[PDB]
Amino acid sequence: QKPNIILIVADDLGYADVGFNGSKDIITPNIDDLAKSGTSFSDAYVAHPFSGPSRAALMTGRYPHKIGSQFNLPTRGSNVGVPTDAKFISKLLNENNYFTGALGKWHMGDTPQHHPNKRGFDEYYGFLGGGHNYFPDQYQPQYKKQKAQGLKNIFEYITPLEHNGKEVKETQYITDALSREAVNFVDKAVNKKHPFFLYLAYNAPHTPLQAKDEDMAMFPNIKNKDRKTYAGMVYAVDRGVGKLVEALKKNNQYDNTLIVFMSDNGGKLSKGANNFPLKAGKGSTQEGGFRVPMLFHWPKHVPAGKRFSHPVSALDLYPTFAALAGAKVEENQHLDGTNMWPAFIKNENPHKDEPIYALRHRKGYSDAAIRMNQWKALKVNQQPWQLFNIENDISEKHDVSKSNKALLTDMVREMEKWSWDNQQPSWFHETTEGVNWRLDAMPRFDKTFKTT
Amino acid sequence: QKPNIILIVADDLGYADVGFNGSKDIITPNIDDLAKSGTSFSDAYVAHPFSGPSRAALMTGRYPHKIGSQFNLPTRGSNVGVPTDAKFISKLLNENNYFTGALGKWHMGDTPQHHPNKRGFDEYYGFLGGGHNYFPDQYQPQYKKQKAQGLKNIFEYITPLEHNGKEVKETQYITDALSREAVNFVDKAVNKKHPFFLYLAYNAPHTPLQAKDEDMAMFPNIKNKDRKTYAGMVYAVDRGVGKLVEALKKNNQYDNTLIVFMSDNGGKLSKGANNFPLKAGKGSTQEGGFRVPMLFHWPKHVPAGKRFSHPVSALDLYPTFAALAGAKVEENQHLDGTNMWPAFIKNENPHKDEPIYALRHRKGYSDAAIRMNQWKALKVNQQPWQLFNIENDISEKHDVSKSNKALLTDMVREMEKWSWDNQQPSWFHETTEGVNWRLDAMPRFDKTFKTT
Amino acid sequence: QKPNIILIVADDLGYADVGFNGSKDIITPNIDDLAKSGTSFSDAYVAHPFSGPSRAALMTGRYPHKIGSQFNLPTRGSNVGVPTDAKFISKLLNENNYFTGALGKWHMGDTPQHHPNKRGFDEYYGFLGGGHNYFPDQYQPQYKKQKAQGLKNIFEYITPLEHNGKEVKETQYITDALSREAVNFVDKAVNKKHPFFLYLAYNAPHTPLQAKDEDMAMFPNIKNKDRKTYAGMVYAVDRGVGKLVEALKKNNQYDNTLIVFMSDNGGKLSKGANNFPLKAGKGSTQEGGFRVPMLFHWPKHVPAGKRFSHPVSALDLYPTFAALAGAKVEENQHLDGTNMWPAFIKNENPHKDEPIYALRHRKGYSDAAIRMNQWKALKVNQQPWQLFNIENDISEKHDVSKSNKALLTDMVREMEKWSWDNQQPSWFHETTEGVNWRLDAMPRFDKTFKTT
Ligand SMILES: O=S(=O)(O)O[C@@H]1[C@H](O[C@H]2O[C@@H]3CO[C@@H]([C@H]3O[C@@H]3O[C@H](CO)[C@H](OS(=O)(=O)O)[C@H](O[C@H]4O[C@@H]5CO[C@@H]([C@H]5O)[C@H]4OS(=O)(=O)O)[C@H]3O)[C@H]2OS(=O)(=O)O)[C@@H](O)[C@H](O)O[C@@H]1CO
Ligand SMILES: O=S(=O)(O)O[C@@H]1[C@H](O[C@H]2O[C@@H]3CO[C@@H]([C@H]3O[C@@H]3O[C@H](CO)[C@H](OS(=O)(=O)O)[C@H](O[C@H]4O[C@@H]5CO[C@@H]([C@H]5O)[C@H]4OS(=O)(=O)O)[C@H]3O)[C@H]2OS(=O)(=O)O)[C@@H](O)[C@H](O)O[C@@H]1CO
Ligand SMILES: O=S(=O)(O)O[C@@H]1[C@H](O[C@H]2O[C@@H]3CO[C@@H]([C@H]3O[C@@H]3O[C@H](CO)[C@H](OS(=O)(=O)O)[C@H](O[C@H]4O[C@@H]5CO[C@@H]([C@H]5O)[C@H]4OS(=O)(=O)O)[C@H]3O)[C@H]2OS(=O)(=O)O)[C@@H](O)[C@H](O)O[C@@H]1CO
Ligand SMILES: O=S(=O)(O)O[C@@H]1[C@H](O[C@H]2O[C@@H]3CO[C@@H]([C@H]3O[C@@H]3O[C@H](CO)[C@H](OS(=O)(=O)O)[C@H](O[C@H]4O[C@@H]5CO[C@@H]([C@H]5O)[C@H]4OS(=O)(=O)O)[C@H]3O)[C@H]2OS(=O)(=O)O)[C@@H](O)[C@H](O)O[C@@H]1CO
Ligand SMILES: O=S(=O)(O)O[C@@H]1[C@H](O[C@H]2O[C@@H]3CO[C@@H]([C@H]3O[C@@H]3O[C@H](CO)[C@H](OS(=O)(=O)O)[C@H](O[C@H]4O[C@@H]5CO[C@@H]([C@H]5O)[C@H]4OS(=O)(=O)O)[C@H]3O)[C@H]2OS(=O)(=O)O)[C@@H](O)[C@H](O)O[C@@H]1CO
Ligand SMILES: [Ca+2]
Ligand SMILES: [Ca+2]
Ligand SMILES: [Ca+2]
């Protein structure tokens, strides 16, 4: 039989905020179990250092730049989204006989054609925008008050959740709610001859910082208020993963299920997170912004107790899942990742002599990153290109560009070459951001790929 | 049997320039007959306050902004047009067994793929551009003189008319010519088992101001020269409508034919028109620019002698005609109107708690309008957003924004939300307009949707 | 039987640099033989005054502007190219039973979908970018040194040649190498029931100026160093044409083969060329930049010893070849040329009362050209539109605009009309060129089509 696949994605999870990736203060035993009896990844990179584009990339297998999705969708709502001509991994799997489910955060389009149920997800339970308030007792009264005033543009963090299009009245803390529905999904899946795919998109530990008192009580030694709340949010995810894991064991699903656990981007230091030993955090092209924790777990298939030290991209998940599912992939889909399993099993670099990119736009310029073999190229804050031996210098403290001029110049030029089929953005997260984009003649790649 | 449908569209007809919509000086008895034995609309809105985009919207059922058609086509000619992937209502009806005809003004593309005969019209007789000179005795000598000089770029107002692609030598005043062919069309239609659709696009009373002496003689009390000519132009349309009506009765078509009569946009005050009691006129986002006269007539179906006081959009005609014809509509067509018939028959607002928009671009900024229930939001002349209780204040004299800040802000934000899937314009009416568009980083929606 | 077709294209060949088009110093007897027993063209125009766009136009039959290909591809590499939805003439011919081959320079896209083997060429031997170093003994050591350093972005002029996707180690001077493979191609073609199409794209006499000592020895009277080298480069092409011609005769192919020989654009005066009697050279909208030498040769079909004096466009080759091959052409392909054979055989103007355009972009403005009947309109160097009787004034010395105001204005307005379906460029030859394009709000057609 072909394996079941679960992709679990935390939102704004810091590099050092789970036990298996070095957390000395937050405790995540159920997630750590999956690590201990599976393989974790010390060099795992998402395709963009924040949510919308990173998630677009997970589902499509393409850098968000190639499909006009370089920015988060408009915060106050919109009728646009990740283009429909890039087939989602869920759609492909559904076409090769998988029962498909998506839970929690979407952030890839509110309209009918961009909805999870038209991107190849049989079941969906969650909220369509960038995040959500965690307590129904807080958020449902506010929404009711505003809808009765006649307002149509309501902040999406307080709007109702939905199940396959129809609104619901959620009763639990959201992290637990999604965990409950993850159980319900795998339970529904037992009564089918088909294998299953589940995209579990937790909004924790993303703002707003809201945790159950019961979870926070587990971290009495954490004296900082925001960090303690953050910790409780993360522990709530861990309880969920443990609850899912039990349901999988109960159903004899555990053994033929590949579980991936990761973050969508780096942690935000001002909102409770820790990215040790990486520099900076969310949104940055420093390692802190797009290098994330990740583990695979699949008994008798994924090695137990290993730590894989070569680069892996979130882009690889698409063709990798497809190869494991026996689903055909077409050359016209323009996948930017690679099926990493053959290299993974031989403990070899799946991106041997090949770059992994990050390009994030700012006001009138762009920050960039390149990861190839031991090297990390970095363009940030309008400075000249720096270069790091990232294997010796994970914190990016020692720029060795002066003694590798030819190598750095080469990497940047390859990025310049790669840039040409990037589409103009189909939207921006705010109206003024698009106005400034047009005003500044963006992209200003003359600044971005100038060399020393 | 499914009903025949006639859509009659005057060009630049003022709000107060037909008898049934309050004209004290111009007399339109045959059009008034249709009103008296049918229902007129006091709150009827086109999708854009001038021709090309408004007509694009009629045919496609979509706001012109969504399909890159926010501007009139180049005045001196072009090889572009209303995109071919938006199925015209004529095409849909033709596919559900209707005999289709288009007469008069097109203004939606000169090229073969944009031609009426490829947009689902079996018969077409008219001129493809923005308007035409009215007297063949004046215009045919000028065209002949210029073609013999060897000139290829001839002002489209003097070029020959055509019938299904072949040129003709028209003998009558154009308003009468089109009326004659409207008779010919419905006559041709009797000898078929099919019902029929007719889009009669009069160019009257659009410039240039040219009328028959016989028509002007009917308005001896009109002392102003331009208004008298204008009046004669409008009376000529009325004669045409009466002539069509006779032919329909002669053929036992009258009783199972829905006739819609309306304008493409508001009247232009400097070229003879009157928009009483509305403010401003053609091209404005004030009511005068996009609120137009309209009547439905269909015996034993449309109430006789009524005046419907709730909002209706030209966008509604597409799905409304389709529902009456029993033609299926697909979610992928992205229709922006609603089938208004169910609400119409119950005398309810078909756009209850839903906005009707107008957005018209200017040099480096945009004017806008929102109509929802009793409210009219207005952005004009780079002023702050104003708000009107349009039911009490049709002339837009009393801005009540200060005492409804939350409501106004809400409406504007919904318009901001709606703006995101507007395409960049595929053309402009002049070369400099596109240059200025690019220079000004348009759209400048940061100005257009800023709130107080 | 339908005829074999060979299209031979020199790169940067000057107007006066072959014997049959007036060369007093360079000697080209084998090319001259084809002229003497065929027809040469005194008014032959490519679609754009430099390589990439001109070649795109040859293959697609469309002005490069219509398909976003107005510029040369990025010099340092890219993953974009001539769009795949414009069917190449090679593809059409392959679909109507032709054995297809492409040799030498491509300059129309490095990626798999843009590769010659996916644009309808069975065989390809050459280099994919803008040109190449001529001596393997010089270029192969440099490439080997750089590949061993680990560099991935290597100047394309020193990279290996390829044969149907696999790299090769070429042993000869490139002009001779391509000539040898042209022989190999026509030889392979004998053993097939099919006729054949061959696109022989010499990079000579394009930079860098490198010739065999043996060739240069034939021009001892040429005292200038660059001109002597240039001459040797051109003689090497002539040897190749003679070698191909022998192989064709050997195989009884000569008599039922249409050979076309031409340049991709005008000669560059600073790199050895001569465009007498034309003004300026490569890249200009003066005649020197896009009026090129051309001959047809096809015994008992093309008249022997004639000089055809009416305009012909490179755009005509597509439908002309197609008509001779009996291959159907569709209206949806939007071909911008005409099948010129019927007019050619009657010694009539195939573009009678129809313009041939050239539009080349510069820093914040564009130069333009129009050729119709005896007239040449010219916009250059930000000057006002000039007009020339090009039949009496081939060097463009006598502007007669003042006494033909109406005619000039007409031509320009038709060009303005033609401009509207030009696509925004899908790429530029350098990063800064695209930045400057966006900064300058290009195209600035308000400057380009302003009239007096
Ligand atoms: O008092 S509040 O609760 O703060 O007020 C509320 C609103 O403020 C909040 O709104 C969201 C939720 O929490 C904060 C803010 O976070 C933003 O959430 C986005 C997703 O919804 C997004 O995160 S992402 O999805 O992982 O990408 C935002 O990050 C992005 O922001 C920009 C767009 O892309 C990047 C930025 O350019 C990305 O961030 S990055 O650069 O670090 O990568 C994320 O910030 C909270 O706002 S706060 O400023 O952080 O405090 C408030 O707007 C409104 O007025 O009131 C509500 C009601 O409570
Ligand atoms: O002709 S070659 O020069 O050999 O070709 C080259 C490359 O092929 C080689 O690639 C590596 C190095 O030598 C062979 C192959 O060995 C594998 O090396 C891995 C690291 O890159 C890894 O070694 S490890 O680091 O000690 O772990 C592999 O071992 C692991 O494999 C499984 C996963 O964990 C263990 C196994 O269960 C671990 O093995 S262990 O028991 O030793 O601990 C190791 O196999 C050689 O390839 S070949 O397979 O022998 O053919 C080629 O990939 C590259 O593209 O080109 C070069 C050209 O020089
Ligand atoms: O003696 S003249 O008639 O003036 O000489 C001729 C030309 O002038 C005329 O050109 C047309 C016909 O009559 C006047 C002018 O009207 C324009 O017609 C357009 C359609 O072809 C269009 O109307 S529309 O279709 O209902 O929209 C024009 O309105 C638009 O204009 C701009 C583009 O979109 C809007 C504007 O931004 C829209 O108008 S709006 O802002 O009110 O909404 C309409 O003006 C007449 O010109 S005049 O200026 O009205 O006097 C002349 O230019 C030419 O050179 O020569 C001919 C022949 O002699
Ligand atoms: O000087 S060298 O020692 O030779 O240095 C070398 C490199 O410089 C060279 O680079 C190329 C090859 O030879 C010269 C230059 O020629 C350019 O070739 C292009 C195609 O590869 C193109 O020709 S084209 O394809 O027929 O069009 C260039 O012309 C175009 O350039 C722009 C894009 O479109 C136009 C321009 O806007 C078009 O020119 S046009 O307007 O005249 O039509 C053509 O210039 C040589 O450069 S030089 O300036 O002549 O000296 C150097 O870059 C590299 O780093 O090293 C080698 C030496 O090892
Ligand atoms: O003062 S001098 O004696 O003239 O100095 C000399 C050198 O400067 C000159 O170098 C060239 C020849 O004429 C000027 C300059 O032109 C530029 O050449 C570029 C490549 O060599 C390129 O030409 S192109 O490839 O044919 O296009 C430049 O054009 C491009 O620039 C932008 C990027 O793409 C386009 C632009 O957006 C393209 O322009 S285009 O679209 O119009 O094609 C072209 O400007 C001359 O420079 S000067 O300062 O203006 O005089 C000097 O560098 C050297 O050191 O010395 C010699 C004398 O010894
Ligand atoms: Ca996030
Ligand atoms: Ca009008
Ligand atoms: Ca060239």
Q: How many CB atoms lie within 10 A of CB C217?
A: 12
Burial per residue of A293-309, b for 16 or more beta-carbon CB atoms within 10 angstroms, e otherwise = bbbbbbeebbbeeeebe
Rg of chain A (C-alpha set): 21
Give this entry's resolution in angstroms: 2.8
Q: Where does C35-146 show beta strands of DSSP type E? A: 39-41, 44-45, 99-105, 123-127
Contact B199, B7 (CB under 8 A): yes
Q: Which residues are paired to B357 by β-bridges?
A: B370
Cβ contacts (< 8 Å) between B418 and chain A: which residues? 79
CA dihedral for A238, A242, A245, A247, sign (positive or negative): negative
The Cα–Cα gap between C82 and C199 comes to 17
**Secondary structure (3-state) at B261:** strand
Q: At what angle do helices A225-250 and A174-190 cross, to 10 degrees?
A: 10
Ligand nearest to the CA of C361: 5
Q: How many CB atoms lie within 10 A of CB A82?
A: 26
Contacts of C11 (CB under 8 A, 6+ apart): C51, C105, C131, C201, C202, C203, C204, C205, C206, C263, C264
CA of B145 to the centre of ligand 6 (A): 70
How long is chain B?
Answer: 452
Q: How many CB atoms lie within 10 A of CB A126?
A: 25
User: Which H/E stretch holds residue C417?
Assistant: helix C405-419
Tell me whether residues B79 and C442 touch, CB distance under 8 A: no
Ramachandran class of B133: left when φ > 0, alpha when ψ lies in -120 to 50, beta otherwise: beta
**Which among C67, C69, C61, C192 is positioned nearest to C123, based on CA atoms?**
C192
Residue B86 tokens read as 């938006």
| Beta strands A196-201; A99-105: pairing state | parallel
Which amino acid, A61? G
Q: Which residues are paired to C386 by β-bridges?
A: C378
Q: Please give the backbone phi and psi of residue B60, each rounded to the nearest 5 degrees, phi first.
A: -95, -25
The Cα–Cα gap between B244 and B253 comes to 11
Ramachandran class of A431: left when φ > 0, alpha when ψ lies in -120 to 50, beta otherwise: alpha
Contact B317, B58 (CB under 8 A): yes
Q: At what angle do helices A225-250 and A29-36 cross, to 10 degrees?
A: 60
Q: Which residues are paired to A387 by β-bridges?
A: A377
For ion ligand 7, residues whose CB falls within 5 Å: B 11-12, 51, 264-265
**Which among B446, B376, B359, B380 is positioned nearest to B411, based on CA atoms?**
B376
Give the domain range for residue A86: 1-452
Give the helix, strand, coil percentages of chain C, each rounded to 5: 35, 15, 50
The Cα–Cα gap between A130 and C164 comes to 48
Q: Chain A residue closest to B448 (CA)?
A: A431
Give ∠ CA A195-A196-A198 in degrees, rounded to 5: 165
Alpha helices, DSSP H, located in B191-224:
213-216
The Cα–Cα gap between C174 and C211 comes to 10
Residue C116 tokens read as 């010659």
Q: Which residues are paired to B263 by β-bridges?
A: B10
The Cα–Cα gap between A444 and A202 comes to 35
C-alpha distances (whole Å) from A300 to each of A198, A327, A340 are: 21, 22, 18
Rg of chain B (C-alpha set): 21
The Cα–Cα gap between B430 and C350 comes to 32
Contact A323, A368 (CB under 8 A): no
Residue B148 tokens read as 């013999």
Ramachandran class of C164: left when φ > 0, alpha when ψ lies in -120 to 50, beta otherwise: left
Query: What are A's interface residues with B at a Cβ cutoff of 8 A?
Result: 74, 76-80, 112-113, 149-153, 427, 431-432, 434-435, 438-439
Peptide bond into A277 cis (omega under 30): yes
Q: How many CB atoms lie within 10 A of CB B422?
A: 19
**Secondary structure (3-state) at C120:** coil
Q: Which chains sit next to C, with 3 or more Cβ pairs under 8 A?
A: A, B
Contacts of A214 (CB under 8 A, 6+ apart): none
Contacts of C325 (CB under 8 A, 6+ apart): C2, C3, C5, C92, C93, C96, C98, C195
Q: At what angle do helices B174-190 and B225-250 cross, to 10 degrees?
A: 10
Q: Which residues are paired to C162 by β-bridges?
A: C126, C167
**Which among C341, C249, C355, C276 is positioned nearest to C302, based on CA atoms?**
C341
Q: Please give the backbone phi and psi of residue B298, each rounded to the nearest 5 degrees, phi first.
A: -165, 100
User: Which H/E stretch holds residue B32?
Assistant: helix B29-36
Ligand nearest to the CA of C263: 8
Contact A134, A210 (CB under 8 A): yes
Dmax (CA) of chain A: 66
Experimental method: X-ray
Side-chain-facing half-sphere of A447: CA atoms under 13 Å? 18
Protein residue with its CA nearest to atom 7 in ligand 2: A348
Contact C301, C69 (CB under 8 A): no
CA dihedral for A296, A303, A346, A286, sign (positive or negative): positive
**Which among C23, C8, C103 is positioned nearest to C296, based on CA atoms?**
C8
Q: Where does B120-195 show beta strands of DSSP type E? A: 123-127, 162-163, 166-167
Contact A375, A407 (CB under 8 A): yes
Residue A178 tokens read as 């999604």
CA of C208 to the centre of ligand 4 (A): 8
The Cα–Cα gap between A342 and A92 comes to 21
Tell me whether residues A416 and C439 touch, CB distance under 8 A: no
CA dihedral for C357, C360, C365, C369, sign (positive or negative): negative
Alpha helices, DSSP H, located in B191-285:
213-216, 225-250
Contacts of C452 (CB under 8 A, 6+ apart): C384, C385, C401, C405, C409
Rg of chain C (C-alpha set): 21
CA dihedral for B127, B133, B137, B138, sign (positive or negative): negative
The Cα–Cα gap between C272 and C229 comes to 8
User: Which H/E stretch holds residue B388?
Assistant: strand B386-389
Residue C7 tokens read as 């299209």
The Cα–Cα gap between A132 and A140 comes to 12
Q: How many domains does chain A have?
A: 1
**Secondary structure (3-state) at C439:** helix
Q: Which chains sit next to A, with 3 or more Cβ pairs under 8 A?
A: B, C
**Secondary structure (3-state) at B258:** strand
C-alpha distances (whole Å) from B96 to each of A118, B113, B322, B326, C433 are: 28, 21, 9, 8, 51
**Secondary structure (3-state) at C227:** helix
**Which among A1, A22, A392 is positioned nearest to A194, based on CA atoms?**
A1
Q: How close is the nearest chain A Cα to the Cα of B193, in Å?
A: 38
The residue to mutate among A127, A134, A142, A207, having the most atoms of ligand 1 within 8 angstroms of its beta carbon, is A207
| Beta strands B4-10; B196-201: pairing state | parallel
Residue B327 tokens read as 């033609």
What's CA A80's distance to the chain center, in Å? 20
The Cα–Cα gap between A267 and A14 comes to 4
Q: How close is the nearest chain C Cα to the Cα of A49, in Å?
A: 24
Long-range contacts of A331-337 (CB under 8 A, 24+ apart): A331/C112, A331/C113, A332/C113, A333/A61, A333/A62, A333/A86, A333/A87, A334/A62, A334/A66, A335/A61, A335/A62, A336/A47, A336/A61, A336/A62, A336/A63, A336/A66, A337/A61, A337/A313
Contact C369, C376 (CB under 8 A): yes
Contacts of B118 (CB under 8 A, 6+ apart): B84, B112
Which amino acid, B330? E
CA dihedral for B131, B136, B137, B139, sign (positive or negative): positive
Q: What single string gives the DSSP state of each residue in B275-290?
A: -TTSSS-TT-SSHHHH
Residue B122 tokens read as 């079996």
Side-chain-facing half-sphere of B309: CA atoms under 13 Å? 5
**Secondary structure (3-state) at C116:** helix
Burial of B4 (0-12, 13-18, 19+ CB in 10 A): buried
H, E, C per residue of chain A: CCCEEEEEEECCCCCCCCHHHCCCCCCCHHHHHHHHCCEEECCEECCCCCHHHHHHHHHHCCCHHHHCCCCCCCCCCCCCCCCCCCCCHHHHHHHCCCEEEEEEECCCCCCHHHCHHHCCCCEEEEECCCCCCCCHHHHHHHHHHHHHCCCCCCCHHHCCCEECCEECCCCCCHHHHHHHHHHHHHHHHHCCCCCEEEEEECCCCCCCCCCCHHHHCCCCCCCCHHHHHHHHHHHHHHHHHHHHHHHHHHCCCHHHEEEEEEECCCCCHHHCCCCCCCCCCCCCCCHHHHECCEEEECCCCCCCCEEECCCEEHHHHHHHHHHHHCCCCCHHHCCCCCCCHHHHHCCCCCCCCCCEEEEEECCCCEEEEEEECCEEEEECCCCCCEEEECCCCCCCCCCCCCCCHHHHHHHHHHHHHHHCCCCCCCCCCCHHHHHHHHHCCCCCHHHHCCCC
Tell me if A12 CB under 6 Å of ligand 1: yes
Rounded to 10 degrees, the C-alpha dihedral B295/B301/B305/B307 comes to -50
CA dihedral for A62, A63, A66, A70, sign (positive or negative): positive
Contact C367, C285 (CB under 8 A): yes
Q: How close is the nearest chain C Cα to the Cα of B104, in Å?
A: 23
Contacts of C389 (CB under 8 A, 6+ apart): C374, C375, C376, C398, C400
Tell me whether residues B416 and A431 touch, CB distance under 8 A: yes
Contact B377, B357 (CB under 8 A): no
